[PDB]
Amino acid sequence: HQAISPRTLNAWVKVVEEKAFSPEVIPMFSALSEGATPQDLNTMLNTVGGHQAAMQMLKETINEEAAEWDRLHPMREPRGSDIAGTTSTLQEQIGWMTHNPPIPVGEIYKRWIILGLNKIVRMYSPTSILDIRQGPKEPFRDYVDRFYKTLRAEQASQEVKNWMTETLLVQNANPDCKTILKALGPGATLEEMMTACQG
Amino acid sequence: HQAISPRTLNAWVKVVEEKAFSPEVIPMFSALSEGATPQDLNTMLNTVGGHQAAMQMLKETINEEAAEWDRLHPMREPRGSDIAGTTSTLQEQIGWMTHNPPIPVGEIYKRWIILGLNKIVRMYSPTSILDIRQGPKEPFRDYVDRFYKTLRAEQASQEVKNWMTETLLVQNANPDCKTILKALGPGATLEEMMTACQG
Amino acid sequence: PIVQNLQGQMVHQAISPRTLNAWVKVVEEKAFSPEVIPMFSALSEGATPQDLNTMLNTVGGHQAAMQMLKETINEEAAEWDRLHPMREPRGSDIAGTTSTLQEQIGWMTHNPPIPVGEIYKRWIILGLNKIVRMYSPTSILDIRQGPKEPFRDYVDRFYKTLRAEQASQEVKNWMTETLLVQNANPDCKTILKALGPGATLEEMMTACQGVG
Amino acid sequence: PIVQNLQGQMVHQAISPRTLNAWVKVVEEKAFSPEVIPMFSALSEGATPQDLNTMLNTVGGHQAAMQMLKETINEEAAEWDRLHPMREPRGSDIAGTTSTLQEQIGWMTHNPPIPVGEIYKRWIILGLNKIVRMYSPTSILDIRQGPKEPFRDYVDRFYKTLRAEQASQEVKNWMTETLLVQNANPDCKTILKALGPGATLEEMMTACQGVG
Amino acid sequence: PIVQNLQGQMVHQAISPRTLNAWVKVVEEKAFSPEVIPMFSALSEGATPQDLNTMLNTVGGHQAAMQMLKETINEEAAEWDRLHPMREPRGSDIAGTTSTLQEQIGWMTHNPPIPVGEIYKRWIILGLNKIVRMYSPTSILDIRQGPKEPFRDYVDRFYKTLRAEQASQEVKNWMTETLLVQNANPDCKTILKALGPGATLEEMMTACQGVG
């Protein structure tokens, strides 16, 4: 066991401040927090500047997951608060991690944090994808890039997302690209759509 | 034992000069000062640039905590001044930390510095949590961000902060959103609250 | 009332003068508000029919109220005689006009007890409920929250008028559920309807705190 | 209550009619202010569960308050039965609905005593605290000193609202320390902040005498 | 209190519920005016330390007042222990927190009597005097006769504020002699100074009848 290096905290702060809570911060958090105890995760989340409403969402989600863990699971065994790093201590956490088999309180807490971060990203989505419409001059590549960005941020289910990509993307296109998309018709990959909709 | 590298001091200087004394400075100080002697802590505190009023406040708080330690407590026994590093050597500080059992003079000094930094953070936070109020035209997201930043800088007990989160957020909202928040009622989560108050 | 002798023989204990004075103050000063029935029940605890008649003698100053109290007592006595044809206490004898004190003490001390005092008390309370219903300054449909009135004061007025109204229990439940919301001012009524149906009085009160 | 016989055998002493009338006056006139709980404690000193039920029968006029008083009593009885599985007094029997008088007298006279009356009194006081919390006209955050209001009157209003609020003890301490100063008018608030943190209520009152 | 048995053995007589209710009404309604100390003395006549503690339990609703009442009681108990080093009643045992009832009855019934109840009553009255001093709306120097105020009303306000002030006796004498005249309005003040020094309150009142 080694204490969290400063450079990881600097990287976490930098990515959070530069990317906001965009969908790409989840993998960055997951990679930075590799092998991190609940104390380290708490320090990482405390270093975040701004976005304190989002941090409140995250800790509310952690509370919900801790309550669910306590409901499902009625040395000392770890409870939801212990896994969250509130009532437990560093020695207990690292002991649980080093037990054979390991009791990875860090990984479970990281899963809870990832769920809360996904909720944060969905809430921080600037606009609903129903309002993402191609302008009368915007290129199809730019419009569709924005569309799939909003779709990734919205985190809709796969079955719904298939319908959205199939129909809504075509329906929201501007009249010229709209006509070319009808001419292409269904069953066409996005490769065909964008290579045919050029200019 | 190893003397602190210049990278740690450069990181401390960078975070202080960039973020000022925001609540996120506390975890950064805690992470940077891991396993640090009082001499290392004094060097880290000396490397700071401006905010000399804040540094004087930290000195005063450390003096108060040293007086309290001397009152509590009637190789050589470490006193408050010895903990502060004014009347102690690096060798004596390596002592009491390599001692069997150890009395971690470094951790106590870090705790006093953390108390002083909490006081400085509250001083640098301009407005009181009771005074944080939603503007008539302000978005609820911005208002909640300001509210939770101020609350994190508020420096009160945890139960008190829980009560503040429960009550003051609804109490201080503008009349346009306060009626919606009352209709939601107690028990509504923050995600529900800021989805409802999106308009 | 009735108390035990040193030898255990139950004997009369007349209602004290200041208890009667308290009853007189209730009758004269309260103007037959709903609270006179709780106060009549309190001041006449374990009272014999003779004690109840002594209490009614002070109500006797009010001619109309006394006359309909007497008429309701007579109706209830007739109903008791119809349904219930020392000796068995006759319905007229429950009122104490005919019976003597020792018969009443014997009936209340019987094994099992014959609570004649409680029965006459219930008849008197029925008559007082009628009188209270008459003297209500306004009907429940007329209670309305003002623009400035706090929801607590309006709720108190509404529930006092509901006590005076004395409708059926299901009707009262509907009234508290719907008419309470209907008569609130628009500022409170918005939150009242936002809470939706089924809200208890506690939620309704807490949500409307300081809205006025 | 319970009193000694001439031979030392403990016997019932029913709550007097005027004590019940005082309780009825408290319930009807005070509109469930915080002071009803001290007054309920005073008027029901050394009272058996039967006496407490007699007192609650007068509260019964208020439908909502009685219903949640009953629900809180039931919850506390269930908790007592869970934690505590003549005979041992069952939690439902502490309420007196099932038990008879002699069992209650025996339990309160036991060596060591089984204060069933005090337990039922505590449950009733919990329910009355809930009712008092509901009926508060304003929240503690809404109490504000006016430009003319003396600091004494404002402090009295603040502390009465604090009693109605019934937050945690640490929360109450923070409230009295900080929110009391925050809500004072600027003329007093200047002196309040000049005194600095840690000032007791005595210093705060003396320094702000006649400032308005 | 304490009463004689039929056989002459002194036994406890608990403070009645309505006396406690009267004390609660005094505490809640009067807002700690000077009159609470006479009323506390009246309602606690011949009271044991247990009875005094029962009375203080109702004051306990007011957090600050209870806390400084307790602190003054502790200070007086410490002073008693310092000056006074069954057994001899310890100063902490005068408060009744440690002692039991029979010890208190024995001490109050001793030959010569050990008035422990009166001593604890004096300590409580000292604490209540402190609380009364705090809650005074204005200082004695701020009491002033208005242009229309009769001299009788102004004198009553002045003397009530003097009771709340609780300065030294010589200081109080000087205040009544000089400050009472100084604060009167010019119409009355002319006659007040014309009477000259040494005028008793009777002459001062009679001469200023109807002057306003």
Numbering used by the authors:
A (entry chain A), B (entry chain D): 12 to 85, 96 to 220
C (entry chain C), D (entry chain C), E (entry chain C): 1 to 85, 96 to 222
Paper text:
The mature HIV-1 capsid is composed of the capsid (CA) protein arranged in a conical lattice of hexamers and pentamers. Here, we present cryoelectron microscopy structures of continuous regions of the capsid lattice containing both hexamers and pentamers.
Finally, we extended our lattice templating approach to understanding the interaction of the capsid-targeting antiretroviral compound GS-6207 (lenacapavir; marketed by Gilead Sciences as Sunlenca®) with CA. We determined the structure of this compound bound to SUV-templated CA lattice at an estimated resolution of 3.1 Å. Importantly, this site is also targeted by FG motif-containing host cell proteins CPSF6, Nup153, and Sec24C. This selectivity appears to arise from spatial constraints imposed by subtle conformational differences between pentameric and hexameric CA as the FG binding pocket is altered in the pentamer by a structural “switch” between NTD ɑ-helices 3 and 4. This conformational change reshapes the FG binding pocket in pentamers, resulting in a steric block of GS-6207 access to the site. Work described in the accompanying manuscript demonstrates how this remodeling also prevents binding of FG motif-containing host cell proteins CPSF6, Nup153, and Sec24C to pentamers.
